[PDB]
Amino acid sequence: AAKDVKFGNDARVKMLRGVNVLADAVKVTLGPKGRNVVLDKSFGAPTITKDGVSVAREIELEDKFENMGAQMVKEVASKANDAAGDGTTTATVLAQAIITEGLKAVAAGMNPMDLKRGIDKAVTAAVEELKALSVPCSDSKAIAQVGTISANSDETVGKLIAEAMDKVGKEGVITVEDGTGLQDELDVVEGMQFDRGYLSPYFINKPETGAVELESPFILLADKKISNIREMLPVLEAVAKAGKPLLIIAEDVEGEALATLVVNTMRGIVKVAAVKAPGFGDRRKAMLQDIATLTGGTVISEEIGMELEKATLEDLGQAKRVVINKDTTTIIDGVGEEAAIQGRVAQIRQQIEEATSDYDREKLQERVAKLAGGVAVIKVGAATEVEMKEKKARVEDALHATRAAVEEGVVAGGGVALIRVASKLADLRGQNEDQNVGIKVALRAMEAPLRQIVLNCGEEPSVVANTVKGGDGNYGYNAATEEYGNMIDMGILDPTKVTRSALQYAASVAGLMITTECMVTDLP
Amino acid sequence: AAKDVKFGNDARVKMLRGVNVLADAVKVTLGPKGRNVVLDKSFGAPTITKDGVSVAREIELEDKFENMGAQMVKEVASKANDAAGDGTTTATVLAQAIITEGLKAVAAGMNPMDLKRGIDKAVTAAVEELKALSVPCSDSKAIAQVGTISANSDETVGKLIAEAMDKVGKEGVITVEDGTGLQDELDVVEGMQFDRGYLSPYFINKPETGAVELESPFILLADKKISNIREMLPVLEAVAKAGKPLLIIAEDVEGEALATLVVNTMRGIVKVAAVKAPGFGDRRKAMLQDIATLTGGTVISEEIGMELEKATLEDLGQAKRVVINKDTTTIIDGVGEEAAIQGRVAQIRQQIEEATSDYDREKLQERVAKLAGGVAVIKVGAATEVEMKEKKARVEDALHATRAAVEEGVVAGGGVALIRVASKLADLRGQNEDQNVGIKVALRAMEAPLRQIVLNCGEEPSVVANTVKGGDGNYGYNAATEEYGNMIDMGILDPTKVTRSALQYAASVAGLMITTECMVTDLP
Amino acid sequence: AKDVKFGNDARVKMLRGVNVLADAVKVTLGPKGRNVVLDKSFGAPTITKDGVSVAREIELEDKFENMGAQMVKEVASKANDAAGDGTTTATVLAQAIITEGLKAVAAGMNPMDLKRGIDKAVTAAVEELKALSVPC
């Protein structure tokens, strides 16, 4: 539709207002004295947040040329959350600083393209330096500290996440749920578990608890739905002669087969459990084949012509114990080989090297949870539902942030390591003065995380900067107790991944934005 | 619907503001210190760009007489991209300059329509001198230099495109797309790869990679959906009597055919595989004949009644290896009779040369890359999505400009060769003085590219223009390092294809526009 | 009964005010230079080529742009009120140092270290203008 168009001043001044209006709304949450933001929603009622990406995602403005600034910095705020959960405010703080301090250089008249080349050379150096400084985390105390830092001084949530990690290990899986009590809970399962259970309740043999018990059973697995007992009888008569209970994981069970299996249990002939296969789409076939290699069984797949009408006792899997309700099943210790189970984990772990989506990185980790270091779940504990919202953020995005710490490592916190790598790059040269100033725009923002924590405290940012830059090593200032010392032993370390990624996304959005000489939009 | 109307003065005054609102925006990105434009969007991330055709394509006004002016310069910007790729800003800069210098003649009192009759003869002269001067761009440093310049002074993109041309050849295929790196990656392909993955996962003989492997197979080529093994059995028995693996490349393979092929594999009888129509529609039949020439095969089709029931090992194609994954099939050399391959590959080069659209140019150029030449793909290295978008854009059209610089050649750049043809045509004359002023409209515009580069560079346009006119030939001003020398040595080359196109479309739009004595359009 | 304005909006008004006066004073400079006319409405307009004329007789209507014009009513006049000549020259130099210094103050440099840099340059330039002088 019909446009307005704005150049130079009228571009960069509107852009600067829009960037600062968005950034100011995000800035107010950072550190131990960092505060909260309220977001209204016409779909029901408001929600309180402490995260910058929640705030940034909601904004859109009346003035088109300022809306442009907000809609650009919305991308760096998402790129932090989409990479690591946390670091969203930090990335926005760095972005607004590299934008403002680069616009200062562009308006002083340094070449916008050599300013970008100088920012880029500083980003490369700072990324390699943050790798070189990346601790070497391994003790569960450092894990609990990065958990309590992200959960915002929460001893309990940091201890809960870190003890889940200490228990399930480097390649178990921890998940999270909208909770059921007025208190939090970690649940952990020392067995295989999945999205389905019984097709008839009359087989509950403990009315006291509601469970169906299968003591050291056989397990039969089929990709087809079963409708005639004709399809089972060859295995059935052999399993009766073998003297053991049986689980049938078909895709589905119906017809006369369901009733006749239920009657063979009801009248005391043989204990037979019918279940539907867990999940939907070929994720169902994948979990059926996971159970097969865990238990020592065949998968009878009708889609490749496999007659259930000739399956044997050799085609059965076995286990130490199985326990069933209507909608879930738990299996304890399947009879399949250690080398076959770890080879099963290796096949899933190979796909984790090429799992190019979020739902892939879910449905592949689902399958290592069931086999390797185990399955665990955090129930979000809260009294109010505005508290269920914020506590769930401080357990979802904080689990994603502690995972992000575990992969790349950690550095000396409150931004102090970012100031230390900035001090090492004080002597970093470009090719010309415009690139020297460009390097000295990117490095200029590396005090901003510390300065914005000290501003959230209500205290003087450039004072703490000029003490921190006098002292050496891990020397910094504790924003929660108001003393100077080693940041690590004062409790404070930042994850490498959130720091390093926030710096890149900030400098990327800034170095592509400060070069703006014209801005175009449809009429108001 | 009712009109507004404007004449002569009042027409041309509004039309000129329209021409400026387009072309003075498009101006702000040009040269080695060239800046950025941003395009506002409420739907998500705003579009940062450097490209004059994307900046032009947006522009639109509610003052319809300024809209008409802007839309005419939008056409020359489109014609630059749609017929040459790069030079979009250069065409737009030349358009407003030839418009300005032509309006300056119309308002001084020259015969308005004989200005086009003189401009067109000056276009002939300028196009023919640019052909007479056209280097012969072809060495890897010259290729890397035109890629460096088109990518906006990015030696990495220039080197990367040259390092792909180094494997695929002059007329081979290289594309670029969405990646996951913090640094770029090149994949390269010889033989043939095509869209269609494996039809069963129980064929994956490397759990470590996800790949299916066929060592020297026979290959059947079948234009009908094979639901039944019935039609295969005589050919299957002939291939069993040779002890080699099989692949069916068909319309489709399904039903009891797919099941029995997968079972004969899974039980350990013989590796016998199948895949469906590559691409979509009858691209089936078309590329199945290219596969037939590559493999040494006969194509069987049911639409013309071909009995598969009698085909032999001589009617089959063969390969050294075939490898299949989750999306694609790669033939690691089909056998194929070279005396037919070269004739068919030359006949595809014929079908490329006479191609009738961009979608034709695609589906024909693929067919030399997927045979004798090479295919290649750049997986984009970029942190943010604004960076993914800009990096893909700069690589996409530098990949266009590199070929454009080989096919029609190059001249000494930054407009310096354009200034050299301006000095060559001082004594050029037509049938009268109006045509002589007309010829001189085109020549007067030839300082504009240089002047707008030097203005983007923040230096004095009129000074560099008059010093460059004091020297001769390829001597010019390096607007990146800020100094005078040989433009060829410093990599500053204007591609003949983009220069020749920019001059033609600018002169054509201007020569039809400056004659405007009335304008008609609907009420706002 | 004051209006009052700070920062951004004040500096933007001050600049336009300086320009409205000094860009008129610019139209006359040199032998190929043009002329201006000014209404002494008590009897009739006066014709001129000079900066002290075009400064003294002008007074605007936006009060904040008028403040800019009134401040340069010293800098354009202090020429003819002490040195005789140089009215337009002083005005041309004044609007240039104002424009480029306000450009630096908008970019975000310290206004008083900008002054200390101007003053260091002026201190040298006053000696250099004697070093490049020959007597009359």
Whole-angstrom distance, CA of residue A390 vs CA of residue B175: 45
> Residues in chain C, how many?
136
Q: What is the CATH number of domain A1-134+410-524?
A: 1.10.560.10
Nearest C-alpha of chain A: how many angstroms from C59?
28
Pairing of strands B475-478, B483-486: antiparallel
Token pair, residue B381, equals: 């290295």
B473 touches chain A (CB under 8 A): no
Closest CA to A55 of A388, A497, A393, A381: A393
Nearest C-alpha of chain A: how many angstroms from B380?
15
Whole-angstrom distance, CA of residue B222 vs CA of residue B253: 9
Q: Report yes or no on chains B and C touching (3+ CB pairs under 8 A).
A: no
3-state helix, strand, coil in chain B (%, to 5): 50, 20, 30
Positions of CATH 1.10.560.10 in chain A: 1-134+410-524
Burial of A253 (0-12, 13-18, 19+ CB in 10 A): buried
Whole-angstrom distance, CA of residue B233 vs CA of residue B236: 5
Q: Where are the alpha helices (DSSP H) in B8-111?
A: 8-26, 52-58, 64-83, 88-108
Give the residue from chain C lying closest to A12, CA to CA. C107
Of A68, A76, A343, the CB nearest to B384: A76
Where is B262: in which H helix or E strand? helix B255-266
Whole-angstrom distance, CA of residue C46 vs CA of residue A502: 66
Mutate to test the interface with B, among A78, A290, A310, A518 (most CBs of B within 10 A): A518
Token pair, residue A158, equals: 């940091």
Which residues from B are below 8 Å from A518, CB to CB?
A: 25, 28, 37-38, 55
Contacts of B80 (CB under 8 A, 6+ apart): B52, B53, B86, B87, B88, B90, B91, B92, B498, B501, B502, B505
- Residue A456 · residue A30 · CB < 8 Å: yes
3-state SS, residue B206: strand
3-state SS, residue A466: helix
- Residue A61 · residue A70 · CB < 8 Å: yes
Q: Where are the alpha helices (DSSP H) in A133-215?
A: 140-150, 155-168
b/e sequence C49-71, b meaning 16+ C-beta within 10 Å? ebbbbbbbbbebeeebbbebbbe
- CA torsion, points A395, A401, A402, A408, in degrees to nearest 10? 170
B45 touches chain A (CB under 8 A): yes
Pairing of strands B328-334, B192-195: antiparallel
Contacts of A226 (CB under 8 A, 6+ apart): A232, A248, A250, A252, A253, A254, A255, A257, A258, A274, A308
- Residue B33 · residue A434 · CB < 8 Å: no
Pairing of strands A246-249, A218-222: parallel
Which residues from A are below 8 Å from C109, CB to CB?
A: 108
Does B257 belong to an annotated binding site? no
Name the CATH superfamily for B191-371: GroEL (3.50.7.10)
Does C86 belong to an annotated binding site? yes
Pairing of strands A173-178, B246-250: unpaired
3-state SS, residue A38: strand
* Start-to-end C-alpha separation, chain B: 11
Residue reference for tokens 């204007």: B494
Whole-angstrom distance, CA of residue A283 vs CA of residue A289: 10
Whole-angstrom distance, CA of residue B13 vs CA of residue B112: 16
> Residues in chain B, how many?
524
Neighbours of chain C (3+ CB pairs under 8 A): A
Which residues from C are below 8 Å from A107, CB to CB?
A: 103, 106-108
Nearest C-alpha of chain A: how many angstroms from C31?
34
Token pair, residue A280, equals: 């939907």
Strand order from edge to edge, sheet including B375-381: B175-181, B375-381, B185-189
Which residues from A are below 8 Å from B39, CB to CB?
A: 520-521
- Residue C57 · residue C5 · CB < 8 Å: no
Burial of A483 (0-12, 13-18, 19+ CB in 10 A): exposed
Does C101 belong to an annotated binding site? no
Closest CA to A349 of A366, A368, A363, A336: A368
Contacts of A238 (CB under 8 A, 6+ apart): A312, A313
- Residue A337 · residue A356 · CB < 8 Å: no
CA distances from A517 to A163, A507, B26, C89 (A): 52, 18, 10, 33
Positions of CATH 3.50.7.10 in chain A: 191-371
Contacts of B204 (CB under 8 A, 6+ apart): B198, B210, B211, B212
Of A2, A304, A505, the CB nearest to B263: A304
A65 touches chain B (CB under 8 A): yes
A497 touches chain B (CB under 8 A): no
Q: Where are the alpha helices (DSSP H) in B84-152?
A: 88-108, 112-132, 140-150
Amino acid at B29: T
- Residue B39 · residue A69 · CB < 8 Å: no
CATH of the structural domain A135-190+372-409, one choice from 3.40.470.10, 3.40.190.10, 3.30.260.10, 3.40.50.720: 3.30.260.10
Does C117 belong to an annotated binding site? no
Q: Is A325 left (phi over 0), alpha (psi -120 to 50) or beta?
A: beta
Closest CA to A482 of A6, A32, A17: A32
CA distances from B240 to B233, B299, B315 (A): 10, 21, 15
Burial of A255 (0-12, 13-18, 19+ CB in 10 A): middle
Which residues from A are below 8 Å from B35, CB to CB?
A: 112-113, 515-517
Token pair, residue A63, equals: 């003035």
What is the 8-class DSSP label of residue A382?
-
Work out how many CB contacts closer than 8 A connect A with C.
9
Closest CA to B365 of B329, B405, B403, B414: B403
Does B329 belong to an annotated binding site? no
- CA torsion, points C21, C25, C26, C32, in degrees to nearest 10? 160
3-state SS, residue A219: strand
**104-143 of A, contacting C, C-beta below 8 A:** 104, 107-108
Whole-angstrom distance, CA of residue A300 vs CA of residue B482: 75
- Residue A179 · residue A379 · CB < 8 Å: yes
CB contact under 8 A, B35 and A516: yes
Whole-angstrom distance, CA of residue B8 vs CA of residue A516: 37
Contacts of B49 (CB under 8 A, 6+ apart): B29, B36, B37, B38, B39, B55, B390, B393
CB contact under 8 A, B42 and A127: no
Mutate to test the interface with C, among A14, A104, A444, A514 (most CBs of C within 10 A): A104
Closest CA to B369 of B137, B173, B93, B148: B173
Pairing of strands C44-48, B493-495: unpaired
Whole-angstrom distance, CA of residue A472 vs CA of residue A493: 16
Which residues from C are below 8 Å from A104, CB to CB?
A: 107-108
Give the residue from chain B lying closest to A82, CA to CA. B384
Contacts of A191 (CB under 8 A, 6+ apart): A330, A331, A332, A333
Backbone angles phi, psi at B420, to 5 degrees: -65, -40
Pairing of strands B246-250, B218-223: parallel
